DNA sequence: TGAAGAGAAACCAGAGTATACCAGTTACTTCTGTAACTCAATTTTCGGGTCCTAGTACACTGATGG
């Protein structure tokens, strides 16, 4: 069944997870969007033929699209935008209020827990997961260990 | 021919007299409870947040000294 907001922005209606995964794998069935492969002049011609086949255009038009839509750090930042200006001001104020300016232990902790296993390939390739496996991001609320854990409920999230 | 009282025109306090409040009580009403459905207004209460100031842990930094 379709997941839809039961509450405006807090909660969905009860829906079967298997049905939802099947809807998704049905709408992406054999479209090449669920690959789980790593990202890889002769290929240019095949790509242009594919674009001509999928967009009903000419090989010349496909090559033109491939050329024009091409992709289009350095800490210096000038000629700012709104949020870029806010970031510049924040950076300058931090440069004068802080003396060591390195990632706090909680920042590195949250990051190194989040990005602990990303792109980690299976050693066996027999425990490789199938294309389309519906990872659920549960988060289990810690019990009330400290008294203040009633106010702001700490949780640990698991990618089931 | 004064003497011991006789009369006479003043003050002066006080005892009824006059007020002056100041309670002292008889009917004669409302207002309870319970019941009920109704609806809106208002209160209470109640679990949980909410913000805020103040420490606190903890990994790292930055010398420091022997």
Curated annotation (Swiss-Prot):
Sequence segments annotated as region (Disordered): 36-47
Residue ranges crossing the lipid bilayer per the database entry: none
Subcellular location: Nucleus
Superkingdom per UniProt: Eukaryota
Family named by the database record: Belongs to the SNAPC3/SRD2 family.
Function text: Part of the SNAPc complex required for the transcription of both RNA polymerase II and III small-nuclear RNA genes. Binds to the proximal sequence element (PSE), a non-TATA-box basal promoter element common to these 2 types of genes. Recruits TBP and BRF2 to the U6 snRNA TATA box.
Subunit structure, interactors included: Part of the SNAPc complex composed of 5 subunits: SNAPC1, SNAPC2, SNAPC3, SNAPC4 and SNAPC5. SNAPC3 interacts with SNAPC1.
Listed name of the protein: snRNA-activating protein complex subunit 3
Gene: SNAPC3
Residues of the full protein shown: 28 to 206 of 411
